[PDB]
Every structure is written in C-alpha cells, then in structure tokens.
C-alpha cells in the first residue's frame, strides 16, 4: 500500500471538507495509504513547511499539496520534500523549473470561470435594455480571478454594480457587510462568496427582505446548496470539490503504479439553480450528509 500524504491550507471550509471526502474516498478505492495534514489556515506559512517536511519523515511515496500560497516552495520544495513526487490540488502551485522536477500532477479549476459563470447567469436574467439592475459584490478578502471573470460576463448587460465591499472570508465579518448592504436598500442582488451568501440567507430572513434581494453565490458549499434546494439562493457554480479530491489521489496512485493519467486534471464547472440540482453533479461536489473529516 503506497503511502500518499495530503497537505491542505486548512479544513474548516465546506469546500475542503469536500476535497477531503474526495481523497479519503478515492484513497480507499485505489487501495492506497492516505494520511492528511492541514496547516492552521492560509496564514500559517511555517506550519505548512513543517508539515511538508513531516510528510517526508513519514516516508511518503507521493505528496498531494494544497499550497498555503502560490510562490512559497517556488524555490524550495526539494528543500522540504527532498525529491518526493508532488501533485498540486485546488490551488495554483508555481515553482521554477529546477523545482518543477517534482510536479507530477495538477488538479484544480481556474477561478476566473467560477466568477464568469455567476456573472453570466445575471447577464442573461437581465439583458441589455431590460432594465438597469443594481448589484452588490461581497467576494471576500482584498485583480483576483473571480472578480475579473464576473466583470467580463457582466460586460454589456443592464446590470450595474452599485458597490463592492471586501473583508476576510469570516462568517461574522461577511454578515456585517450583508447587513450594511441591506440598509442602503437600492440593491436587487448580492453576488458573493459562499460564506457571505450563507450569511445573507439568514440576514435577509431576520430583516424580512427575502423576495427583495436575490442571492448569487460565486461557488458551492453545503449551506449554499441547501439554499438552492430550498429556493433561498438563485444560482451558484460548482468546481466539484469532491472530484478535485479524487483526481489528485488518482494522479498520485497511477503515477506510482506506472499507469496513464491526466497530468493536468480539471473538472468541468457546472451551473446550479434550484430547479437543476442533478445528483451526479452534486455527488461530485459536496461531502455526504454524514461524513466527518478523516485523516487516514
């Protein structure tokens, strides 16, 4: 049983809980020995380094890495993992050619299309000449693929962005902005991060503005899914987290077992609306209703 070590940026998200189910599930079908570690969160640059080194000391045959930053390990990696085969997951892991020696596989989705899809839904619901419609952006921390992609789909379409607030992807911080958006009341939709949209669902109910403001999520999560399913959310795209999870394991498994495999895997984004929640599509996105984070 080959030893595969997976290192995430964290594991508090609905997103990574799902990426986890993907790996733990695939790892078991592929018959490998998965062991997963999660940095404290995106700011724990050093903790991830120790973990990268820790995977090596465990004697991992391959490392599945979800960088806590793109340019970290860009000139190291071999300094932490030595020369263990590494496969990128979810996040962009760029590293010079001297380092790339280790890159055997990549899995992930260009977050430009995630934002583009979200915008496209709005662009079509409100075409040019149908009626100026006011939007509010709540995309997160701080450019940024999602944003530029949204902007391109919104290009030419009667949809006007009244304002765009930013803040860390913390439930409470996001709730704060949703509350702010609600008070300036000349908004028809709130396009935002899963977490923000989730807040908005509750905040729109306690303020009786359900029916007033529509919600469009820039990505999926249980909660946002639960919102679509119950008609509290209008639209949200999926980059099939569970699948991104399976692929990384499959890549590593095959590379070691000397088998064929997409060197650069990338699931096909899919749009979701309350009336189009195809099982197969969400089964490839969110973790099952009973799954608890598993690390081996």
């Amino acid at each position: 049983d080959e030893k595969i070590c997976a290192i995430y940026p964290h594991l508090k998200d609905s997103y990574w809980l799902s990426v986890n189910y993907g790996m733990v599930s695939e790892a078991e079908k592929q018959g490998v020995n998965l062991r997963v570690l999660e940095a404290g969160g995106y700011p724990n640059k050093s903790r991830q380094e120790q973990q990268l080194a820790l995977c090596t000391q465990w004697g991992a045959n391959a490392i599945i890495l979800g960088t806590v930053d793109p340019h970290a390990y860009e000139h190291n990696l071999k300094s932490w993992v030595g020369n263990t085969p590494v496969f990128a997951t979810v996040n962009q892991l760029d590293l010079d050619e001297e380092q790339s020696t280790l890159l055997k596989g990549e899995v992930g989705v260009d977050w430009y299309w995630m934002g583009y899809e979200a915008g496209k839904y709005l662009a079509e619901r409100h075409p040019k000449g149908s009626g100026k419609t006011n939007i509010a952006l709540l995309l997160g921390p701080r450019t940024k693929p999602v944003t530029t992609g949204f902007y391109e789909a919104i290009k030419n379409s009667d949809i006007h962005i009244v304002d765009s607030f930013w803040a860390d992807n913390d439930k409470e911080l996001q709730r704060n902005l949703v509350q702010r958006v609600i008070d300036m009341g000349n908004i028809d939709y709130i396009v935002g991060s899963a977490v923000a949209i989730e807040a908005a669902i509750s905040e729109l109910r306690s303020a009786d503005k359900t029916h007033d403001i529509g919600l469009v999520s820039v990505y999926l999560s249980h909660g946002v899914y639960r919102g679509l399913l119950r008609n509290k959310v209008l639209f949200a795209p999926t980059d099939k987290m569970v699948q991104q999870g399976r692929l990384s394991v499959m890549q590593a498994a095959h590379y070691l077992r000397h088998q064929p495999y997409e060197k650069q895997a990338s699931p096909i984004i899919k749009p979701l609306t309350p009336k189009t929640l195809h099982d197969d599509t969400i089964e490839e996105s969110l973790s099952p209703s009973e799954y608890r984070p598993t690390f081996s």
Partner: protein
C-alpha cells in the same frame, strides 16, 4: 598625617561606587552591563590601591584587620551583585524563548478546537439538508430518527466543542499574559490556574470521539504541560530581582562599615607624630 590625603580618596570613591552599583542594576541589555560595571571595575581598582596606601599608615593589629576584612566584603558583595545582574539578563532572555514556544503550541491547539467547531457546524447543515430528502420521499420513520440524531449528536456536540474551544482560548491568554508577568501573586495565580485548566482540558479531549484530532490535542496538551516550568523560572525572575535589591541595600552597610574603620585608621596615625 598624609593618611588624610588617602582617606579622602577612599571616602570620596566610596560614594562614586555606590552610584555605580545602582547603575549596574538598572542595566539591561548586555551593553549597559559590560559598561556600568566595567567602570565599576576601575573605580574599585582605585579604591584598592588607595586602601593599600592607607594600609601602611598604621600598625595597630586589630584595626589593620578590620580594614582588610571590610574591603574583602565590599568586593565579595559587588562581585555577587554582578552575578545577580548577569543572571537577571539571562532569565529575561530565557523566559521570552520558552514562552514564545508555548504561544505557538497553545495557538495551534486553539486553532484546532476552532477547526472542529467550524466542521461540526457545516456538518449540522449537511445533516439537516439530508432530512429534507427523507421528509420528501415520505420515509417518515427515518425522518424523525435523524431528528433524534440532530439533537443527541449535532446539537450536543456543538455546545460541547464551544466549551472546549473556550477552554483552549483561555489557556492561550494565560500564556500571552505570562511573558510580561512580574507580580509574584499574579504569577502564582496564573500558574495554578493554567495547571488546573490544563488538567480538566486533558479529560475533555480524551472524551471527544474523533481519533485523529483527540490524539493531536492530547499531544499538544502534554507538550504544554511540560513547558509549564516557565512559571517556576518566572518566579526565579522575581526572586532574583529581590536579591539584586537586598545586595544593594547591603553595599551601603559595608561601605559604611569600611569608612568607619578607615577613619579610626586616620586617627592613631596622628598619634606619636
């Protein structure tokens, strides 16, 4: 006779010394030490040679001894005081290093308990989403079996972890306050509070069923449990500063003792001219 020329050099240099030892205690960085004390060294050398000259201005056996002894005690006192200062500078450096070590440990334990409160929550939503399916497929008996699980597990666990996290958060603050701590009583308090808080938390995690996690929190806890001595050395800190003060108050009694003798020595050096 000429003993006045020498004892006026002793009485005068004694004052300038007392001022140099104060300057040495208020040192703190290794520079002020190898300085406010290096000047002390010199001010001492001079005291010794002038005490050497005054030494041959009499032959009274009794008095010539008190002088010798008085001088040694002043030297032994300053010498010991200097040790107190090197030690004080070292203790500070030490406490910082060992504390920052626990900050990192305690911080991970906090972030870990938070990760679980975070997971438990999204899982609760997942669990409820699933009920929607059963409910609308008329699987009645299972619908309210999931409701049972919702209360007996998800709701129970949610409160259970809030507590665990709250507890790990407390521990982290005890450590943040720990470094700058200087009040002997507060150090005592935090010390037993931390130990206590740690004992109870060691059980709560061993209870929480979640293999991987529980194991990690236990390793983090025993590791913090070890670093606990930081409190004992946090006292050595306070203690060592009580010393540098007593030594100071002593320097004065010695320099007094000395001059009292260097005076009886100027007299009876004026007898039989």
């Amino acid at each position: 006779g000429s003993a006045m020329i020498e004892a006026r050099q002793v009485s005068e240099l004694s004052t300038r010394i007392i001022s140099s030892v104060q300057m040495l205690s208020n040192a703190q960085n290794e520079q002020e030490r190898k300085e406010a004390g290096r000047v002390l060294f010199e001010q001492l050398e001079s005291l010794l040679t002038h005490i050497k000259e005054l030494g041959g201005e009499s032959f009274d056996s009794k008095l010539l001894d008190a002088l010798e002894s008085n001088v040694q005690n002043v030297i032994n006192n300053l010498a010991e005081l200097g040790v107190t200062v090197e030690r004080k500078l070292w203790l500070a450096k030490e406490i910082d290093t060992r504390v920052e070590e626990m900050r990192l440990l305690s911080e991970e334990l906090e972030q870990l308990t938070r990760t679980q409160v975070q997971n438990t929550s999204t899982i609760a939503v997942a669990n409820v989403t699933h009920i929607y399916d059963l409910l609308e497929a008329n699987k009645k008996d299972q619908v309210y079996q999931a409701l049972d699980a919702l209360v007996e597990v998800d709701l129970d666990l949610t409160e259970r972890l809030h507590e665990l996290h709250l507890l790990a958060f407390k521990m982290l603050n005890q450590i943040e306050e720990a470094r700058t701590l200087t009040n002997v009583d507060r150090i005592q308090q935090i010390q037993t509070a931390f130990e206590n808080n740690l004992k109870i938390m060691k059980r709560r995690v061993l209870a929480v069923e979640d293999p991987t996690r529980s194991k990690q929190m236990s390793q983090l806890l025993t590791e913090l449990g070890k670093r606990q001595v930081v409190f004992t050395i946090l006292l050595q800190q306070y203690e060592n500063n009580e010393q540098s003060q007593q030594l100071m108050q002593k320097t004065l009694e010695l320099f007094s003792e000395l001059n009292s003798t260097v005076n009886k020595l100027v007299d009876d050096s004026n007898k039989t001219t």
